[PDB]
Design a protein around this ligand. Structure first.
Ligand code: HEM
Ligand SMILES: [K+]
Length: 248
């Protein structure tokens, strides 16, 4: 159950103006995938049992940026700082999650509902909570299930965020896009994953894990066949992720 906090009218006005400015900025800079990854890596540190981590603005801290999993996200933070400065009333936590919602929207994805009121927290979570691309389904459930508190459906739908963007050998070490159209939010991640490896496209071991797991594979098949079902389940999961630890 979520009970969202009240924010002032002025705060609500700034969310709306920031949403529009983020559309223009993220479209022009071609940085939707990185902005989605910043929001995801922000939220994905939540541990439900201790209620630590999650989307509370800490990823901008040099000490969280310096986590190995977060290679390259300093770029994201830097790119957003001038625009954030235009919206002093907004928390960083809300601004980065709004950026992730807008990243999905401006690449043609679902409209993920957005609620303001996240407070910036003073201290980043311990390093080590983000998923490891070399591991498989048990590990995915450890991180998205046992720590974050998301469902198996959420795991597969959120994995579809790889439909935009690419890996970089100087960041993670992996290299290349998952899809032929890495600035378009669609179900291609799943149709690629099914079709086997393609010259010039990437699959992580963690993506492949989806194919061999009895619960994940029917969802991959669903999303490959029905982009609308993918969009519905993605929007549900992204909203949940963006709200972990918030408004509970
Ligand atoms: C399931 C487990 C996860 C693993 C192991 C994983 C791993 C990775 C890796 C290794 C990269 C490449 C980083 C680089 O070299 O630039 C990456 C990027 C990406 N990830 Fe994930 N990922 C996972 C889940 C997610 C989720 C939950 C989403 C958000 C819904 C997400 C969104 C993205 C985006 C959009 C990119 C591309 C970034 C860019 O183009 O710079 N990933 N991920
Ligand atoms: K795509």
């Amino acid at each position: 159950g979520k009970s969202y906090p009240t924010v002032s009218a002025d705060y609500q006005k700034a969310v709306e103006k920031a949403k529009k400015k983020l559309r223009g900025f993220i479209a022009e800079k071609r940085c939707a995938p990185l902005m989605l990854r910043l929001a995801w890596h922000s939220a994905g540190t939540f541990d439900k049992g201790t209620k630590t981590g999650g989307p509370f603005g800490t990823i901008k801290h040099p000490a969280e940026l310096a986590h190995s999993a977060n290679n390259g996200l300093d770029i994201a933070v830097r790119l957003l700082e001038p625009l954030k400065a235009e919206f002093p009333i907004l928390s960083y936590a809300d601004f980065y999650q709004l950026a992730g919602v807008v990243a999905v929207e401006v690449t043609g994805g679902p409209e993920v509902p957005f609620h303001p009121g996240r407070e910036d927290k003073p201290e980043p979570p311990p390093e080590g909570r983000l998923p490891d691309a070399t591991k498989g389904s048990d590990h995915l459930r450890d991180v998205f299930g046992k720590a974050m508190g998301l469902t198996d459906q959420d795991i597969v739908a959120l994995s579809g965020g790889h439909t935009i963007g690419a890996a970089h050998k100087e960041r993670s070490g992996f290299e290349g896009p998952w899809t032929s159209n890495p600035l378009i939010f669609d179900n291609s991640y799943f149709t690629e994953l099914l079709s086997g490896e393609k010259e010039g496209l990437l699959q992580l071991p963690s993506d492949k894990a989806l194919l061999s797991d009895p619960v994940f594979r029917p969802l991959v098949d669903k999303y490959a066949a029905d982009e609308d079902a993918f969009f519905a389940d993605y929007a549900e999961a992204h909203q949940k992720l963006s709200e972990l630890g918030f408004a509970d």
